[PDB]
Amino acid sequence: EAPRSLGPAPSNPSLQALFQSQPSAEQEWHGDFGSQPQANRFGAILEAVVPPRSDPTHEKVLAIVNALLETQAIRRDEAGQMYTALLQRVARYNSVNVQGNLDRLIQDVKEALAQRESVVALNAFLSTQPAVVERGQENYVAFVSALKLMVTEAPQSEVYQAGPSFFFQTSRHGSQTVNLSQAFDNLRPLWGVSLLTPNTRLLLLLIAPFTGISRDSYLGHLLTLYRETIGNTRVDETTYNEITEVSRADASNLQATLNYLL
Amino acid sequence: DPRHALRDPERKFLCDRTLWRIPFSSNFMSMGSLTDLGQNLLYANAAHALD
């Protein structure tokens, strides 16, 4: 969770380069000229009348390297190395066409970063999974639809292939991984029909809040009971919080309530 | 047998037709022609000196 780049705006690499390599008198992030001394007044007047032209090459390269840092194509500690290498290359092949290409690349990378600021793996997994079963092609179809809906609506969830099996993980740094291949292999003999492994039990518990299934089928009954259990768990959490907060005006009290409550 | 002089072992090796190899990699292994410390300094355009 460390800041990838120094600038206050993680996106807009041009803005980040503005923040890093520009004087803090032109920037904006949100006196009495005439009483100033003669030297300052004359310097400001001359600079205003005849503005000093400067090369926007180092700024462009800094914006590019900030974009690369944001994209993670360049590690944090080699930013200076890449900056110097890019400056050397640009100076070696400097031209108006090269400057135009640099500006175009900065604009394109800024747009791409702004636009950007698992599904294909699930599609491949569904493709390798058989789509026809001899025990009702509606429970399977609705379950697949629920799985796709939940993986799409999950904020940070990953589906990936690890050798010969496909896995589903609820979060990047979590501890809830479901072997989808084995779960569906276990579920296949009993679509339309205690005997389920913990992997497929966890899959069902995860998909229950995000699910068309006919209630007559075994999977329908299991999903209804899992929904009921999850609702009981939420209401039990609310009751536990209320009881504990009231009883704290003892860890032994938490022990007693949890034991009586589970 | 007894009635003999005492020992004083001396050891030495004899290596022929071999060059002493000191690889540039940090772990002295050869995991590729371009060593990792060769990839370092590749775009650093530094000079250093060897002594």
* Residue B37 · residue B24 · CB < 8 Å: yes
Contact A88 B44 (CB under 8 A): no
Phi, psi of A167 (to 5 degrees): -115, 150
Residue A223 identity (one-letter amino acid) = L
Contact A88 B45 (CB under 8 A): yes
- Asked how this structure was determined, the answer is cryo-EM
Residues of chain A positioned with their CB less than 8 A from the CB of B43: 81-82, 84-85
Query: In 3D, which of A184, A186, A183, A190 has the Cα closest to residue A218?
Result: A190
DSSP A11-71: S-HHHHHHHHSS-TTT------TTSS-HHHHHHHHHHHHSPPP---SHHHHHHHHHHHHHH
B6 in reach of chain A (CB within 8 A): no
In angstroms, what separates the C-alpha of B44 from chain A's closest C-alpha? 6
B42 in reach of chain A (CB within 8 A): no
Q: How far apart are CA A192 and CA A215, in angstroms?
A: 10
* Residue A110 · residue A14 · CB < 8 Å: yes
DSSP at B36: H
A85 in reach of chain B (CB within 8 A): yes
Q: Is B48 left (phi over 0), alpha (psi -120 to 50) or beta?
A: left
- Stated in angstroms to one decimal place, the resolution of this structure is 3.3
Q: How far apart are CA A220 and CA A51, in angstroms?
A: 75
DSSP at A77: G
Measured at the CA of B11, the angle between CA B8 and CA B14, to 5 degrees, comes to 150
Residues of chain A positioned with their CB less than 8 A from the CB of B46: none
Three-state SS at A131: coil
